[PDB]
Amino acid sequence: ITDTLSPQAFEEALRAKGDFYHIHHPYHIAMHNGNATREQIQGWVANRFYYQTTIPLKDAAIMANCPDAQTRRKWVQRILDHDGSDGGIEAWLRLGEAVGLSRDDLLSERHVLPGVRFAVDAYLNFARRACWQEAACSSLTELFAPSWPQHYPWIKEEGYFYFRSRLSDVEHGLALAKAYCDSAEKQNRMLEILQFKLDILWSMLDAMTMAYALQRPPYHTVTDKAAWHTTRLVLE
Amino acid sequence: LITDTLSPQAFEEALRAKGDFYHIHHPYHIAMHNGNATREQIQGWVANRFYYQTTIPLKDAAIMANCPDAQTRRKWVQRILDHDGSDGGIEAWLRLGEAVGLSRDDLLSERHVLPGVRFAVDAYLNFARRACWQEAACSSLTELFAPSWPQHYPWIKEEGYFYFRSRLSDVEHGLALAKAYCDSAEKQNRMLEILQFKLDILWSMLDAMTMAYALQRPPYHTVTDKAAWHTTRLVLE
Numbered sequence: 205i206t207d208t209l210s211p212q213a214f215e216e217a218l219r220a221k222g223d224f225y226h227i228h229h230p231y232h233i234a235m236h237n238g239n240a241t242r243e244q245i246q247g248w249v250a251n252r253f254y255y256q257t258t259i260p261l262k263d264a265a266i267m268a269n270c271p272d273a274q275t276r277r278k279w280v281q282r283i284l285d286h287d288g289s290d291g292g293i294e295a296w297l298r299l300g301e302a303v304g305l306s307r308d309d310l311l312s313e314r315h316v317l318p319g320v321r322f323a324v325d326a327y328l329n330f331a332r333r334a335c336w337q338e339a340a341c342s343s344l345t346e347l348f349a350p351s352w353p354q355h356y357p358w359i360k361e362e363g364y365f366y367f368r369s370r371l372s373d374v375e376h377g378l379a380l381a382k383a384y385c386d387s388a389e390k391q392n393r394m395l396e397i398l399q400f401k402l403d404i405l406w407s408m409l410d411a412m413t414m415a416y417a418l419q420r421p422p423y424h425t426v427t428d429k430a431a432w433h434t435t436r437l438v439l440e
Numbered sequence: 441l442i443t444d445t446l447s448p449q450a451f452e453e454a455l456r457a458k459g460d461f462y463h464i465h466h467p468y469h470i471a472m473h474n475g476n477a478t479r480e481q482i483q484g485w486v487a488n489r490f491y492y493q494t495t496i497p498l499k500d501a502a503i504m505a506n507c508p509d510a511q512t513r514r515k516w517v518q519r520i521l522d523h524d525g526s527d528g529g530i531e532a533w534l535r536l537g538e539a540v541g542l543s544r545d546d547l548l549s550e551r552h553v554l555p556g557v558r559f560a561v562d563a564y565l566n567f568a569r570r571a572c573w574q575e576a577a578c579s580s581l582t583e584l585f586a587p588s589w590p591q592h593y594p595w596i597k598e599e600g601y602f603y604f605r606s607r608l609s610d611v612e613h614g615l616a617l618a619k620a621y622c623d624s625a626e627k628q629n630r631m632l633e634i635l636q637f638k639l640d641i642l643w644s645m646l647d648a649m650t651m652a653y654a655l656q657r658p659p660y661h662t663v664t665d666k667a668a669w670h671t672t673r674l675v676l677e
């Protein structure tokens with residue numbers, strides 16, 4: 205971008221990035237067409253649960269950096285949504301039981317791969333350090349975001365549906381990129397922040413590929429046991 | 441898992457046992473060491489290891505920003521001096537890059553650095569920024585586990601290669617710190633966890649490079665042939 209794009213040209217630039225959305229990863233494709241194994245489904249739920257539990261922290265980090273009462277009023281709804289005040293992280297826990305993991309397997313974080321954790325912690329850390337407009341606008345990948353019964357009859361229906369139901373906002377993070385990125389300076393940088401975010405989603409699934417699709421989890425050449433660290437070190 | 445506090449020497453043994461997990465046991469390191477790596481693999485290893493290397497001094501400065509002990513700073517700043525020159529260990533990597541057929545701009549641009557590498561390496565710097573200075577200083581200890589190309593890869597250039605091995609050539613410090621500081625079972629167990637963390641970073645970097653250069657599945661390989669990952673230290677620049 206050399207000349208400042210208009211609001212609506214900047215929008216299509218932002219959406220042209222949906223071309224790299226994680227639905228295009230082979231791990232995501234082998235899941236939604238029924239070729240994924242039990243280990244792969246459960247491995248996805250457990251790792252993707254890590255992303256889900258970090259997002260309210262990421263959103264709270266944005267609010268800590270935001271002197272604007274009005275924006276905080278609207279942004280806190282994201283935390284209310286995940287934590288419940290119910291709540292989206294409870295939909296993830298029932299999905300975990302639906303695929304044969306327990307609450308303490310998910311809650312413990314032990315199955316979470318180091319490569320997923322690094323990719324997810326990258327998001328949190330960016331949110332912590334970046335100015336709030338920029339962190340807030342990275343949530344925008346959920347524009348690109350909107351079957352398992354037939355595919356995997358072993359998944360419990362009861363829990364699987366509670367995952368679907370519960371998953372009952374972006375009218376924001378887009379109305380704000382266009383409203384904050386009024387130079388080629390800001391636009392270029394927003395497209396790069398957006399790319400960052402897409403890389404995080406792609407890397408989570410790369411980490412899952414190596415471990416569950418390729419039988420190359422960390423240290424596979426040294427042990428058959430899980431040996432990675434399982435702690436959020438700076439928080440716990 | 442430590443139930444009863446080990447002696448400092450028993451506790452050194454448990455730290456050193458963690459070398460079983462050192463990144464030399466990764467198939468990507470092994471393929472390089474025994475001559476089965478492609479030039480693409482080697483060049484991408486140098487390009488990506490470079491990012492780790494230019495981050496070390498940032499990480500060391502972070503420990504220092506957190507260290508109110510002048511005496512430790514005096515020892516710790518020496519690592520920055522060795523990396524940055526006063527050249528320059530980072531220069532040794534740059535000359536290694538040229539010997540494998542990368543330009544200095546290739547390396548300094550950080551264009552070729554894979555997101556998986558960036559995230560692992562940035563994890564290390566972020567821990568040093570936020571952890572107390574002792575825990576962060578002790579995570580440097582994987583260096584204890586550290587200490588054939590011309591024959592397997594005769595297309596590697598002589599001078600840059602030699603210069604890299606030359607400029608090659610501190611650690612009696614950070615183990616002393618761990619033995620002195622980790623004086624409870626809780627500190628011990630947490631320090632083995634912080635060392636696992638560090639080990640995981642090293643391993644994750646090689647996984648990222650495996651996916652990209654050994655398996656031909658770099659990010660967005662199903663969408664584009666081109667590098668489309670982000671290439672920026674977003675918070676720093």
Ligand SMILES: O=C(O)c1cc(C(=O)O)c2c(n1)C(=O)C(=O)c1cc(C(=O)O)[nH]c1-2
Nearest residue numbers: 256259263292342343344345346349401405
């Ligand atoms: O705050 C955020 O940034 C954020 C981002 C994303 C994302 O990047 O797609 C999701 C969510 N939240 C979320 O709650 C969620 O259920 C979700 C599902 C997906 C997906 O494609 O599977 N992304 C996201």
Ligand SMILES: O=C(O)c1cc(C(=O)O)c2c(n1)C(=O)C(=O)c1cc(C(=O)O)[nH]c1-2
Nearest residue numbers: 463496499529579580581582583584586642
């Ligand atoms: O080649 C290797 O296997 C290797 C590993 C490590 C390590 O264990 O972190 C370092 C280095 N090399 C290295 O050259 C270096 O300057 C360095 C600094 C540090 C540190 O943690 O501060 N590790 C390493």
